Swiss-Prot record, chains A, B:
Its EC number is 3.1.2.-, 3.5.1.-, 3.5.1.124, 4.2.1.130. Optimum pH is between 6 and 8 for glyoxalase activity. Significant inhibition of glyoxalase activity below pH 5. Optimum pH is 8 for aminopeptidase activity. One of its GO terms (cellular component) is cytosol. This is Protein/nucleic acid deglycase 1. It comes from Escherichia coli (strain K12). The gene is hchA. Optimum temperature for glyoxalase activity is around 37 degrees Celsius. Optimum temperature for aminopeptidase activity is around 43 degrees Celsius. The active site is at 181 (nucleophile).
Length: 278, 278
């Protein structure tokens, strides 16, 4: 199994992660489980998902990493939440369709795939974040904001005033905020302004790992910046410097360190949210 | 040469045009020529290009057409204009990178490719249209707005208030407006508001052709709507119902019917613009 990045002919000088990377970090079936919720939430609040509308990430050598939102990271936690009784809505800054890292799609998962198929339109024809934000008030029916990981979360989200307003609303209004892997990079939207996440702790994909993955061809080059240290400059605490599939809780801020943490984050979020709404 | 659409593995159920389509409508070298401008424009006005930030177009059968801006259509006219002394700037509604139909890129063109390479950053890191519009005034240094074709021009542009404001500025301020193929679909941004293009005539890709190309696999399905008739409802006149590589002029509105018209549109635009600015 080669460690060389693979060609994405759709774009100019763009690559998918190497075969080795894929054999070691993806699988045709997920580790989705523990989906037992006999007493589901019966209210109206939904999960607001802020997804990636861009697939290509430029690396330090000019090459583009063909990324986007991680399917395992996005789907598992929503599967648990949907099962727990929480439906979801999807939004992107531009309003353009969600861009997934399909090379990580568990195409043979007899549960995840049909769940994906039955909500495909929500991802394909998302709402424009700004439109959602304009209607926000203390009574808005969103029980939580979910920012899934995938390197696509590094594009736009970390510098969007819309994401900032959104996060500000959620925190100020005592709502849940869920994220994993690189999803917390969006929290950087709060720099230069009121930062209600100051002093919060989370786990996430460590910058240290991003400096190693290209060695195995997960990406065609190095990142041009690291969200970990920036978040630390923004007054946030990152508790891990490695990948173990762990999850963490700081009040209503629920996070995960990687796709290996997706199933666990689902359980944690479902458990925490059910208890709050019942 | 097969007439079956080809798979774009980067996306879910997305396809590039068939081999047949490509053998008959693309080429490793363009028909770029007649680039003779001994007395180039020596002012500051630039060409403002409004490009596509989305590559995937949903068809009537749920399948996605892997499109974007047509490289021949985009590059040839800018090559002539740049040669004529007019540099250019690129903007997209979202600010995300320009998405090209690389399957039409003349990868062996010893002129177009280097010209592309030397301006790549303008396409990759475009300005956000709204930002450009906010700074617009009668003295703004844009001699023309260029909306290249490609089916990607059908996404977002036809319903963007930013594009409407932009076109309104150009017309009201006696600037040139250039477009071809599906690029004029962006003119539909003017519906529901002041429409300074009412009564204008142009040539463009005929709806009739869009209803045939899928038969040869250029697209994986049929369009969900046709910009031709809408433009007609908006008070515009489309002079052609076929593809001949022709170009047309209506005051400062310069257009083309397809990629076969790109080289000619370049000459026309360069000629017309030089005469106006000198
Ligand atoms: Zn559902
Ligand atoms: Zn130049």
């Amino acid at each position: 199994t080669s460690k060389n990045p693979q060609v994405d002919i759709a774009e100019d000088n763009a690559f998918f992660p190497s075969e080795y990377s894929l054999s070691q970090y993806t699988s045709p079936v997920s580790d989705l489980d523990g989906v037992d919720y006999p007493k589901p939430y019966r209210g109206k609040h939904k999960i607001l998902v802020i997804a990636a509308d861009e697939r290509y990430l430029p690396t330090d050598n000019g090459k583009l990493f063909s990324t986007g939102n991680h399917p395992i990271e996005t789907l598992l936690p929503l599967y648990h939440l949907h099962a727990a009784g929480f439906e979801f809505e999807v939004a992107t800054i531009s309003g353009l369709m969600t861009k997934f890292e399909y090379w990580a799609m568990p195409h043979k998962d007899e549960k995840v795939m049909p769940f994906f198929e039955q909500h495909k339109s929500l991802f394909r024809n998302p709402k424009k974040l700004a439109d959602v934000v304009a209607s926000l008030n203390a009574d808005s029916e969103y029980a939580a904001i979910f920012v899934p990981g995938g390197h696509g979360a590094l594009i736009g989200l970390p510098e969007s005033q819309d994401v900032a307003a959104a996060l500000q609303w959620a925190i100020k209004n005592d709502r849940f905020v869920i994220s994993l892997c690189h999803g917390p990079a969006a929290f950087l939207a709060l720099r230069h302004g009121d930062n209600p996440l100051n002093g919060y702790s989370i786990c996430a994909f460590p910058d240290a790992a991003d400096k190693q993955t290209p060695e195995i061809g997960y990406m065609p080059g190095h990142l041009t910046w690291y969200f970990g240290e920036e978040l630390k400059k923004m007054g946030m605490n990152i508790i891990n410097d490695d990948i173990t599939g762990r999850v963490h809780k700081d009040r209503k801020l629920l996070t995960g360190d990687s796709p290996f943490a997706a199933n666990a984050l689902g359980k944690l979020a479902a458990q925490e949210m059910l208890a709050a709404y019942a």
